[PDB]
Amino acid sequence: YDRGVNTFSPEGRLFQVEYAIEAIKLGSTAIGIQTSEGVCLAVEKRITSPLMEPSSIEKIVEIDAHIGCAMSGLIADAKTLIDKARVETQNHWFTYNETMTVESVTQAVSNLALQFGEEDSRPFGVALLFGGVDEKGPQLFHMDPSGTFVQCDARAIGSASEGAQSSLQEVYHKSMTLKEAIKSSLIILKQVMEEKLNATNIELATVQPGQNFHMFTKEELEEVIKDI
Amino acid sequence: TTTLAFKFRHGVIVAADSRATAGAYIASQTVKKVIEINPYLLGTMAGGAADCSFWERLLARQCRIYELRNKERISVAAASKLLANMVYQYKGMGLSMGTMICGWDKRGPGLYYVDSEGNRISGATFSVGSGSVYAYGVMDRGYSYDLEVEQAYDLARRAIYQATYRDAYSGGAVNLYHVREDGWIRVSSDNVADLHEKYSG
Amino acid sequence: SYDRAITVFSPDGHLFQVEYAQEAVKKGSTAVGVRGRDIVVLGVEKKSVAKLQDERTVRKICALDDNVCMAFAGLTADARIVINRARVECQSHRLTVEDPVTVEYITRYIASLKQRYTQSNGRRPFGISALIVGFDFDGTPRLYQTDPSGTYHAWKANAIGRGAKSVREFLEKNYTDEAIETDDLTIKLVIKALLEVVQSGGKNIELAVMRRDQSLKILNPEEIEKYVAEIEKEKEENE
Amino acid sequence: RFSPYVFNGGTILAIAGEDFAIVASDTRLSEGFSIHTRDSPKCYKLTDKTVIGCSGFHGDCLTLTKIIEARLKMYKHSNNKAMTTGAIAAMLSTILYSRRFFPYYVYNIIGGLDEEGKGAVYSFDPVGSYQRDSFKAGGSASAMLQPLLDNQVGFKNMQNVEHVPLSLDRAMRLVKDVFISAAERDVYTGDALRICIVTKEGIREETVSLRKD
Amino acid sequence: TTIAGVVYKDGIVLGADTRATEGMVVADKNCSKIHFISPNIYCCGAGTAADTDMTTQLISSNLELHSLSTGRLPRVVTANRMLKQMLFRYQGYIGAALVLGGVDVTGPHLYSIYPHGSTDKLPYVTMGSGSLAAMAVFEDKFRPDMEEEEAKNLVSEAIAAGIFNDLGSGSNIDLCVISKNKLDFLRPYTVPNKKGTRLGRYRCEKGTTAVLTEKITPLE
Amino acid sequence: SRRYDSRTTIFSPEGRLYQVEYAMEAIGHAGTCLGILANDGVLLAAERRNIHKLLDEVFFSEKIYKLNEDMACSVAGITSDANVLTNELRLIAQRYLLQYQEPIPCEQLVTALCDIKQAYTQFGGKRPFGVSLLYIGWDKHYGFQLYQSDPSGNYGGWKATCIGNNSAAAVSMLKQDYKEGEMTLKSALALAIKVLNKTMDVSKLSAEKVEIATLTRENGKTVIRVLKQKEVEQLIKKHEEEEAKAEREK
Amino acid sequence: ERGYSFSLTTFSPSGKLVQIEYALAAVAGGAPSVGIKAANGVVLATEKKQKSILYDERSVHKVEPITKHIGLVYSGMGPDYRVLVHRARKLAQQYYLVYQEPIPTAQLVQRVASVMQEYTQSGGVRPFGVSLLICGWNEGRPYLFQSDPSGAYFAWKATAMGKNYVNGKTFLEKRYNEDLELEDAIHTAILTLKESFEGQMTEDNIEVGICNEAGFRRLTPTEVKDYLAAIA
Amino acid sequence: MEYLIGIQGPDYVLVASDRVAASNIVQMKDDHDKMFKMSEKILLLCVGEAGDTVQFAEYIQKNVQLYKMRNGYELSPTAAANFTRRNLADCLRSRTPYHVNLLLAGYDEHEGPALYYMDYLAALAKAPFAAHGYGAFLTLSILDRYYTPTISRERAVELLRKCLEELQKRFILNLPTFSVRIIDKNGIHDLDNISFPKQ
Amino acid sequence: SIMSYNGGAVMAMKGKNCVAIAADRRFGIQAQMVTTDFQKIFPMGDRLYIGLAGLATDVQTVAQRLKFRLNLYELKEGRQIKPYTLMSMVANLLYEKRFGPYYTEPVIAGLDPKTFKPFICSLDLIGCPMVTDDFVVSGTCAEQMYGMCESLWEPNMDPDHLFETISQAMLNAVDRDAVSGMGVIVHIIEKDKITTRTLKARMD
C-alpha cells in the first residue's frame, strides 16, 4: 500500500518502473533476431478497423543511416526519443565525422532514461530495441524505461513475448546465416498470430551490411507468405 | 579565386579554381572550393572557407534529419528561409558567406546564389570572383539554355581558362561536376597546366 | 493501493484521467466525414441550436489554409486554443519551409504539444480530440485524427462520437471505387451514414465539400435539399 | 590596449609519407633577438597515430592541446576506442568556428597514421578551415620553404622533372636541407630542431642543432 | 541660470534667477528653479532642468515616505546622503547643479551639490555660470551671525552682481527665507536688467493677407 | 472519493468539466442581466445588489462597465474578481487600438478575454473566474454583436443571454417574444420592464435598485446612454399603464 | 468540492468562499470604527481601548493619514492595517508624483484599492482581516467609502463596522435618511456608536478623525474630550 | 537608386517594378521580381538591403495571411499600414536596425484604393504620389508639369510612358525590363513587360 | 540634424478668451517636398490640442503612446484631462528615455476641461516643461521673431487679430527661406466652437 513511485518501497524497490514493464505488455509484440549476416525483426501492426492505414503506425524506425530501430509500448514517447537520437546521431556525425555507433546510442538515451524531471512529470514507459550495423557488424540491442542495457542475440517484447521467448531460444541459430533466419522468423510469427497472415497484419525489418537499406521494401512480405 | 555556376538543359554545371593563396605567394593549390553536401546536391565555397563549410554542414543537419522522418521532397524555399535568417543574425559580425546553392529540383534545373548580407536570388548564371568579370564576357555572349552537356564542359572551363590564364589568385585544378536527375556526376579534375595547351589550340 | 491518477502511471500500466478524458469526446459533439481521389466531404451537426441565438458564434469547424482544414469535437474552449495554436504553427510552416503545409509536420506539432499539455502538474491535459481534414498536394486526399495522449492516425473516413464502430461497419461498403466517383452520390452517402447518427433532422446538419485543392464551402439549405431529393429517390427506386 | 594575440616564433614543417608521417618543428621559442627557452618542442603527440604541432601564440597552444587531451579521454572512455583522424580534424574546426568571434591564434599541422595506417596533412588556420593534403609548411619561415619544397618534393619550377616517391630517409635530408636555408634568413628558426617521425611501429624523434642567433 | 545661498543667524535665505537661456537668446523668461524637498528644506535647481526637476521630486519622494512615516521634522543630512548616493551611482551622467539648505531642529545647514554628488558644509554656496560674482559678494561681505534684513540684502546684491557679470543670468531675482518659525518665498523681487525697447510700434491689420478655407466644430 | 479532492487543474473523471459545473453555480448566485435584439441600437439592464437608500450612488455605472467608446460590458458575478478583468480587456482593447489605430473588433476581442479566463481555468491550480460579463458594440463587418463570457473558455455569446439562474423564467419569455426586424428599441425596453416586473423576484421595478444602459449607434460618436433612473420612473408608470390596460379586457 | 483550490482565492460549495470566510468572521471581531460623511467633509470616529492602565495611547496611533488631504481609519484586526498603511504610503505617493497633482480622490480609491484588492484577494498564505473606511476631499465634494477583505468597495454617508455592525447599520438606516445637517449627522452617528460601547468613556477610549475640504486634520484625545461626548 | 511608380487613380493604383537586380557592370539576373503579393487588396513593395526587405516581406506576409483566416477578413489599409510601422518603430531603436525605402499600395472595399508611405525611419505619410531614388528630380519635373488625379488607368500608363523615356538622359544605367501591375476590386492583374533597346 | 530633417515649426499663441495653435503644412525630407497633407497637430480629448515638431516617427509614436495612456485614464473616469495633467504626462513619458529620448518639440495648447480658461505650455524633447502664459516665439530671421511679436501679440487678443498676427509671423519667418513654405494650418479653439483655418503660402 501507499506506493511512493520513484520514492522507494518499505521492502523495498521501485514500483512504477515495474509498471512500465507492464506497459510493454499492452504494446505490439516485436521479435528480434541477430545473425552473423544481418538482423531480422518482425512485429504485428494489429489493425483495429479497416479505416486504419497500414503504414500510418510502424514499430520499426530508422535512427541513423546504418542504425535501425524497433519501438515498444507507447508511440508518442517512442517517436520523441526516436527523433531525439536522430539529432544525436547528426551531431555525432559532425564533430567526429563518423556515424554514431549503435553502442553509444544506448547510453545517450540511458542518461535521460529516468530523469524524474519534466519528462522521463510522469516517466515514459517506452521500451526501445536498437538494431543496425556498427563497426562490429550487425547488432541487436534491447533497453527498457529503467535504462537496462544487455546485448541479446534474439529479443522479444510486447504481449506474446512471454510465449515468444519460450520457443525463441530453442530454435535460434547463432552461427547460421540469414538464409535460415528467413524461415526462422515466420515460425514464431505464425505461432503467436491467431489470424491469417497478410502484408497489412505484420511488418518485416531486415538490415544487412551488404544489402541495405533495407530496412525493408514494399511487397516483400507477401513473398515470404507464398514461400511457406 | 574564380567561381561560376549556371543552369542549362541538363542540371547545373559547377566549375571553380582550386588555387587558394595569400597575396602573390603560392601556398596551397589543392584547396577544393566545390563541396558536395549530398549525393543529389552540390555546395560551393567562397569568401570565408569555414563559414560556407559550417552553414552547409548546418544546412545538411536539418535536411538529413528532415529526410529521415520523411524522405519527402524538400523545396529550396526551405533552404532559403532557414539559412538566410540564421546568417542574417551574424550580419555585420565579420562572417562572409559567398556560396551558391546548387542541386536538382524535381520540376527542372535550378540555381541559387546566397550572400552573407542577405542577398539570395534564383537565376540562370552566377559568377563570383576576381577574374569572374572576364568570365561574363566569354560565357554570357555564347551562353544558351539549350547548350549540350558536352558543350557545357568546354564553355565553363574556357571561362576558367580565360580567368586562370593570367591572374594572381586564380589557378590550380578545375573541379567540374554535372548535375542530373539522379544527382551530380563526377566528370574530371584538370589542372590549369593542362588548360594551357588544350584551349589555346 | 489505488491512488487514482495524477501524472504517474497506475499499477495496471495504464492511466485514468486519460481514459476518463476520452468519454468527453463520446459525450461531445459528434462528427462524420469521407474522402475521395479528389473531392472530400465532412459533417458535424450536433449543434443543438434553436435558431433563436447567434449562428456564427456556435460555428466551430474552421480551416488553417484552403488545403488543410480543422475539424474537432467536444468542447470548443480548448479547441479554440487548438485553432490558434495550429494557426501559429501552420503560419510558421507557411513562413519556414514555404511549401504547402504537410500533414506529417503539423500533426506532430499538435501531438508534441498535446503530450506536454498532459504532462506537467502543471499544464492541464486535453479532454477533447480532433481530426484533420484536407488534401495532399496534387489532389491526393489526406485525413488524420488526434488522441488525448498526443498521437495521430489516418483513416479512410471520419467516424467518431456515438457508434464509432457501427458507422465504420457502414463505411465498409464505402470502400468501393464508386465513392467518390461523382460528388452527387458522395454527399448523398454522407447524409446516409449520418441518418443513423443522432437525430439527423436536416436543421443542424452542416456539411462542407472540398473539391481537389479548392477551398470548401458550407452547403446552404438549397443544394442540400436537392442532394436529399436524389437520396430519397434512390431509396424509393431501390425496391 | 592589451594585445591578446602575439607571435612567439617557431616554424612547423610536417611532410607525411605514404605509409608514414614526419613532423618537424624547431624548438626555439623567441620574440626578437632574445631567446625565451632554447628547448621548446612544438610537436605534441595526442596518440601514437597522431602528432600535431602548435605554432603562434603560446597561451592558445597549451590551451588547445590540453583541451584535446581532455577530449581524447572523453571519446576514449565512451566508445572504448581511439579517436579517428577525421574526428579530431572536424572537432577542431567546430571549436574554432564557435570561437570565430574571439578565436585562438595558432598555426597547426596534423600528421600521423590514419585509420588505414597512412599519412595525411591538414593545414589549420584560426578560422578552422582544413583539407587533406600530402605535405604542408607552416610558420614564419614557410616563405622560403614551399618554393624550395615544391622544387624538390613537388617537382615544380623545372623542366623534365620526374616525380619520385620520397623514401623515409629521403624526407629526412630534404627537411634538413630546407631548414638550413631557412635558418640563414629567418631569425625565429634555430637552436635545437625537433623532427618527429610517425611510423607504424611507433613515434620517433630527433634533435638537430642550428644557429643560436 | 544662477543659484546661490547663505546661512544667517536665524535661518537660511535662498535665491535664484528666473532667466533660463538656451543659446544666445533667452528661452524661458520667467521660471522658478527653487524646488520643494521638505517643509523645512528647499532646493534650488540649475544645470539640466528636466534632470534636476525629476531628481528633486524623487529625493522628496524618498523623504515624504521617510518623514510622514516617522512624524518628525526631516534633516538636511538625509537629503544630502540620498543626493550623494544617487549621483555617485550614475557617475556624473546626470548633470545636477543644486543648492541644498534648510533649518532643522539641529539648526541651519547648507551644502553645495555637484553633478558627481560631492557636497561640503559651507555657510555660503554659489552655483551656476554666474556664481563667480555671486561668490565674491558672499566671500568678502558675509560673516557669521548675519542679521535678517542684512542677509536678504546680501543675497539680492549677490544675485544682482552675479547677473551683471553673467550673460545668461537675468530676469527676476528670487528671495526665499527659510527659518524655524517663519518660512517665506518672495517672487518676483526686482529685475536688474531689461531688454532694449523698440524705436516704434508696428500694427498688422486685415487686407495684407487672405484666408484659404475655414472649418467650424461647435462644442457643448 | 475520487472527485472530492481539491484539484482545479486536471479535469474530473466521466468527461464532464469538474469546476465548470460549480462555476455556473456561482454565476446563478445573485446575478442579474438581460439582453434582446434591437435594430439601429442595443439595450441592457442592471440591478443594484443593495437597495439601501443611504448609498451615495457615486459609482455612477457599476454593474455596467464601459470598456471602450463604442463598446461596454455588464458584470454579473463577484465584483472583486471582475475588476481585474475590466482593466485587463480594457488594456487589451487599448493596445489593439494603439497598434492598428482602429477600433478592436468584438469577434477576437471577446475570444481574447475568454482565452485569458481560460488560462486561469486550465493550469497552475489557479482559481477560475466565477464572473460572467456581457459584451455589446458595433463593427464595420457584422454590425451589432452580442456576447457573454463563460469561465470554461467557451463563450456563452449569443443574440440573447440568461443571467442569472433566476432569469430562466425570462428565457421562455424571450423565445416566445423572439422577433426580427422591428425596432423601436422601446418595444424591447417595455418588454424588459415586463421581465423585471414578472420573471425577476423584485416586483414594481424599483428604480434605485436597478439600472438600464442602452447603446444607440451613431456615426461616428456611437453614444452610450446611461439613463439611469431618470425616465425609468416613467417607464414604471408606462408598464403599469399596460397592466392597467390589460385588466380592462376581462 | 472544494474545487476552487487557491491562487487567488479559496473555494465554497454553495456561496461566497470558505476558509477566508473564517477570517471575515474575525473582521467582525475587530476594532469597531464609525465613520461619517457630512456636508463638505468626512468624519471618522474610531474606538481604541488598551488592556491595562499601564499603556499610553500617545505611542500607538490607529489613525495614520496617507496624504495631507486624505486620512483613514481601520475596522478590523492588527498590523495587516499597518501593512497596507506603508503600502498605501508608497502606493498613493507614487500616483501623486506621476501626474504631480493629487487628482480627485475617486481615482485614488481606484488605484490605491486596486493593489489592496489583489493584496487581500490573492493568496497571502494566511488571510487578511483588515477592512478600511476610505475618505478624502475631491473637487469640493468629499467621499466616504468602505472596503473589506473581499474587495467590495462601498459608499456610505454614515457607516460602522466591528461592533454595532448589526445594530448601528440598522440604526443609521432608520434615524438617518438621505443627507442631513453636518453636525446633526455626527450626533446620531455617535449616539449609535455609544450604543454597544462601554459605560466608561474617556478621552483615551475613542478617537475622532475629520477630513476637511481644506485637508485632513488628525485630532488628539485632548481636543476630543474638550469638544463633546456627544461631540457636535 | 530605383523607384516604382506611385500613380494613384480613383479606382486603381498603378505600380511598375524594375526587374534588374544586377550590380556593378554585367547583368546577373534580368527576371528578378521585386513585387510581392500579400493579399488581393494589398500589395507589398520594398527596396533596400536584401535581407532587410526579404525579412519584412516574410513577416508582414504571413501575419496578414494569419489574420485573414482568423476573423475571415483582411486588415484595413489603415490598420495594415500601422502594423508594419510597429515593426518599423522597433527598427528605429534596435540592436540591429534595418533599412527600407519603398511604400505599400493597397485597396479597400468601402474606402476604395489608398496609398500610404513607408520609410526606414518608421515615418508614415499619405500622398497620391512620391519620388524615391536618383530619378527624384526627373520624376517631379514631368509629373508636377502634367498630372491628372482622375486620369484613367490606361492613360496613366500613357503618362508613365513619358517617365520611362526620361529614365535615361544623363544616366549611364540600363534597367531594360520593367514589370507593371494594376490594382482594382478584383486584385492584382499582370501587365505586359517593357524592354529598352540597348543599341 | 533630426529636427531639420523633416522640419516644421509649431507656434501656439493664446488670445483673450480663446487659444490658438498653428503648424506649417510642409512635410518632406531635407530640401525636397513630399506631401503637404501630413498632420502634425493632433486632437486630444475635446477643446484641447497639442503641437509636435520634429521627426515624423517621434510625432506619431509619442502621439500614439500619449493617446494610449490618455484613453486608459479616460476610460477609468469619463471626465476629460487637465492641461496640468497632460503636461506632466508628456514630461514623464519623455523622461522615461534618458540617453535615448525622442527628438521632437511638443507644445500643449488647449482649454481647461472644467472651464473656458485657456492655458498653453511647451515641453523640451528631454521632458522639461517650459511655462509661458500665452505667446511663444519662433522663426528664422531674428528681427522678425522677437521684434514684431512684441508689438504684434496683445495682452488680450481677438481671433481676428490673433489669426492675422501669426499670419504675417509665418509669412515672414517661413517663406523667407527657400526650402520653407507649402502652407501653414492654424487651429483656434474656444469654449463655444472649434475653428480651423489655413494660411496662404507660395508653393516654391
Q: Please say whether the beta carbons of E115 and E47 come within 8 A.
A: yes
Cβ–Cβ of C54/F118 closer than 8 Å? no
Residue with cell 468501393: C176
Distance CA G119, CA G108 (A): 16
**Grid cell at residue B39:** 549525393
Q: Please say whether the beta carbons of D187 and D213 come within 8 A.
A: yes
Binding residue ranges of B for bortezomib = 49
List the 131-160 stretch of H: residues with Cβ below 8 A of B. Answer: none
**E126 tagged catalytic:** no
Q: CA Rg, chain C, in Å?
A: 19
Distance from CA of F167 to the nearest CA of G (A): 18
A63 contacts in chain B (CB < 8 Å) = 68
- What single string gives the DSSP state of each residue in A89-117? HHHHHHHSSSPPPHHHHHHHHHHSSS--S
List the 82-121 stretch of A: residues with Cβ below 8 A of B. Answer: 83, 86-87, 90, 94
Query: Which chain I residue shows the shortest CA-CA distance from H128?
Result: I35
Distance CA E134, CA E167 (A): 14
Nearest to F82 by CA among F133, F149, F28, F9: F133
Please give the C-alpha separations between residue F24 and each of F18, F45, F79, F135, F150, in angstroms, as whole numbers.
Answer: 11, 21, 16, 18, 8
The SS3 call for residue I83 is: helix
CB nearest to C111's CB, from A16, A51, A76: A76
Cβ–Cβ of H55/B88 closer than 8 Å? yes
**Grid cell at residue I99:** 540617453
CATH number of the domain at G1-232, out of 1.20.140.10, 2.40.280.10, 3.60.20.10, 2.60.120.380? Answer: 3.60.20.10
CB nearest to C75's CB, from F12, F154, F158: F154
**Grid cell at residue I140:** 528664422
Please give the C-alpha separations between residue E131 and each of C88, D120, E87, in angstroms, as whole numbers.
Answer: 64, 80, 21
**Which ranges of G122-177 does DSSP label H, i.e. alpha helix?**
167-174
Q: How many CA atoms lie within 13 A of C200 on its CB side?
A: 13
Distance CA B18, CA B192 (A): 10
Most distant CA atoms of chain G, gap in Å: 57
| Interface with I, mutate which of F71, F87, F94 (most I CBs under 10 A) | F94
The SS3 call for residue A59 is: coil
Q: How many CA atoms lie within 13 A of E75 on its CB side?
A: 7
Percentages helix, strand, coil for chain I (3-state, rounded to 5) are 30, 25, 45
Cβ–Cβ of B61/A83 closer than 8 Å? no
φ, ψ at G137 (rounded to 5°): -135, 125
Distance from CA of H110 to the nearest CA of I (A): 22
**Grid cell at residue G32:** 469597531
Distance CA I187, CA I133 (A): 18
| Interface with B, mutate which of A62, A64, A90 (most B CBs under 10 A) | A90
Side by side, the strands of the sheet bearing D132-133 are D43-45, D50-53, D109-112, D121-123, D132-133
φ, ψ at E84 (rounded to 5°): -80, -25
Distance CA E160, CA E193 (A): 9
**Grid cell at residue E53:** 526637476
Distance CA F92, CA F111 (A): 12
Q: Is A94 on the interface with C (CB under 8 A)?
A: no
Residue I156: what residue type?
N
H125-126/G215-218 β-pairing: unpaired
Q: Please say whether the beta carbons of F7 and F18 come within 8 A.
A: yes
φ, ψ at B92 (rounded to 5°): 85, -5
Q: Return the partners of chain B (3 or more C-beta pairs < 8 Å).
A: A, C, D, H
Query: Which chain C residue shows the shortest CA-CA distance from B83?
Result: C96
H79 contacts in chain F (CB < 8 Å) = 100-102
Distance CA I50, CA I62 (A): 11
B38 CB-near residues (< 8 Å, 6+ apart): B60, B63, B64, B103, B183
- What single string gives the DSSP state of each residue in G110-132? HHHHHHHHHHHHS--SS---EEE
I37 contacts in chain H (CB < 8 Å) = 126-127
Nearest to C112 by CA among H70, F117, A84, B82: A84
C192 CB-near residues (< 8 Å, 6+ apart): C170, C231
Q: Return the partners of chain A (3 or more C-beta pairs < 8 Å).
A: B, C, D
**Grid cell at residue B141:** 555572349
Distance from CA of C220 to the nearest CA of H (A): 18
In H31-177, which ranges are E strands?
A: 36-37, 43-44, 105-108, 112-117, 125-126
I146 contacts in chain E (CB < 8 Å) = 25
Distance from CA of F98 to the nearest CA of I (A): 6
> Sign (positive/negative) of CA torsion G192, G197, G203, G208?
negative
Distance CA B122, CA B110 (A): 7
Q: Please say whether the beta carbons of A185 and A228 come within 8 A.
A: no
For chain H, the domains span 1-196
Tell me how long chain G is: 232
Q: Please say whether the beta carbons of C13 and C146 come within 8 A.
A: no
I165 CB-near residues (< 8 Å, 6+ apart): E204, I13, I149, I152, I153, I157
Q: Please say whether the beta carbons of I105 and I51 come within 8 A.
A: yes
Q: Is H54 on the interface with B (CB under 8 A)?
A: yes
Q: Is G157 on the interface with F (CB under 8 A)?
A: yes
Distance CA I52, CA G231 (A): 58
> Long-range contacts: G67-70, Cβ < 8 Å, 24+?
G67/G92, G67/G93, G67/G96, G67/G102, G67/G136, G67/G216, G68/G215, G68/G216, G69/G102, G69/G136, G69/G137, G69/G211, G69/G215, G69/G216, G70/G105, G70/G108, G70/G135, G70/G136, G70/G137, G70/G211, G70/G216
Distance CA F178, CA D133 (A): 89
For chain G, the domains span 1-232
DSSP state of F163: B
Scored b (16 or more CB within 10 A) or e, D149-166 reads bbebbbeeeeeeeeeeeb
Mutual angle of helices B76-88 and B49-69, in 10-degree steps = 130
Question: Cα D104 vs. chain centroid, distance in angstroms?
Answer: 16
Distance from CA of C49 to the nearest CA of A (A): 31
Residue C101: what residue type?
V
The SS3 call for residue D198 is: strand
| Interface with D, mutate which of B19, B28, B61, B116 (most D CBs under 10 A) | B28
Residue with cell 487678443: I157
Exp. method: cryo-EM
Mutual angle of helices B149-164 and B132-142, in 10-degree steps = 150
Mutual angle of helices E76-90 and E49-70, in 10-degree steps = 140
The SS3 call for residue I201 is: coil
Peptide bond into C47 cis (omega under 30): no
φ, ψ at H157 (rounded to 5°): -70, -35
Q: Please say whether the beta carbons of H10 and H95 come within 8 A.
A: no
Catalytic residue among E1, E21, E55, E126: E1
Cβ–Cβ of H54/B140 closer than 8 Å? no
Beta bridge partners of B97: B47
Beta bridge partners of I110: I48, I119
E34-38/H112-117 β-pairing: unpaired
The SS3 call for residue I121 is: strand
Q: How many CA atoms lie within 13 A of D33 on its CB side?
A: 0
- What single string gives the DSSP state of each residue in F43-110? EEEEE-S---TTB--TT-SSSEE--SSS-BEEEES-HHHHHHHHHHHHHHHHHHHHHHSSPPPHHHHH
Cβ–Cβ of B65/A87 closer than 8 Å? yes
Cβ–Cβ of A97/D94 closer than 8 Å? no
Distance CA E169, CA E178 (A): 23
Q: Is H97 on the interface with B (CB under 8 A)?
A: no
The SS3 call for residue E4 is: strand
Question: Cα G172 vs. chain centroid, distance in angstroms?
Answer: 16
Distance CA C140, CA I164 (A): 76
Residue A83: what residue type?
D
- Listed resolution, Å: 8.0
Q: Please say whether the beta carbons of D51 and D37 come within 8 A.
A: no
Distance CA A37, CA A212 (A): 12
Cβ–Cβ of I75/F68 closer than 8 Å? yes
Residue C13 has a CB neighbour count (10 Å cut-off) of 19
φ, ψ at H103 (rounded to 5°): -120, -175
Cβ–Cβ of D94/A95 closer than 8 Å? yes
Catalytic residue among B1, B2, B44, B99: B1
Binding residue ranges of B = 49
G110 contacts in chain I (CB < 8 Å) = 76-77
The SS3 call for residue E44 is: strand
Mutual angle of helices A102-111 and D58-79, in 10-degree steps = 100
CB nearest to I196's CB, from E30, E48, E215: E215
Nearest to E40 by CA among E105, E83, E102, E106: E102
Distance from CA of H29 to the nearest CA of B (A): 6
For chain I, the domains span 1-204
Distance CA C105, CA D63 (A): 44
Distance CA G160, CA G32 (A): 7
Q: Please say whether the beta carbons of A63 and A89 come within 8 A.
A: yes
Distance CA A35, CA G131 (A): 81
Residue I15 has a CB neighbour count (10 Å cut-off) of 22
F146 CB-near residues (< 8 Å, 6+ apart): C54, F35, F42, F134, F135, F136, F157, F158, F159, F160, F161
Number of separate helices (H) and strands (E) present in chain F = 6, 7
Mutual angle of helices I83-95 and E49-70, in 10-degree steps = 110
**Grid cell at residue A188:** 514464431
Distance CA H48, CA H61 (A): 17
A215 contacts in chain B (CB < 8 Å) = none
> Spelled out in words, what is the top-level CATH class assigned to the domain H1-196?
alpha beta
| Interface with B, mutate which of C91, C93, C98, C138 (most B CBs under 10 A) | C98
| Interface with G, mutate which of I86, I92, I128 (most G CBs under 10 A) | I92
> Dihedral angle at the C-alpha atoms of F159, F164, F166, F168, nearest 10 degrees?
30
> Dihedral angle at the C-alpha atoms of D172, D173, D174, D175, nearest 10 degrees?
50
C26 contacts in chain F (CB < 8 Å) = 15
Question: Cα I140 vs. chain centroid, distance in angstroms?
Answer: 17
Q: Please say whether the beta carbons of C150 and C111 come within 8 A.
A: yes
Cβ–Cβ of F26/G13 closer than 8 Å? no
Residue C81: what residue type?
I
List the 69-128 stretch of C: residues with Cβ below 8 A of B. Answer: 95-99, 102, 104
H125-126/H112-117 β-pairing: antiparallel
Nearest to G179 by CA among G73, G36, G29: G36
Distance CA A38, CA A134 (A): 11
Cβ–Cβ of B61/A86 closer than 8 Å? no
Distance from CA of I7 to the nearest CA of H (A): 13
Q: Return the partners of chain G (3 or more C-beta pairs < 8 Å).
A: E, F, I
Distance from CA of A120 to the nearest CA of C (A): 10
Cβ–Cβ of A118/C119 closer than 8 Å? yes
User: Which CATH code is given to the segment(s) I1-204?
Assistant: 3.60.20.10
- What single string gives the DSSP state of each residue in D30-61? ESSSSEEES----EEESSSSEEEE-EE-HHHH
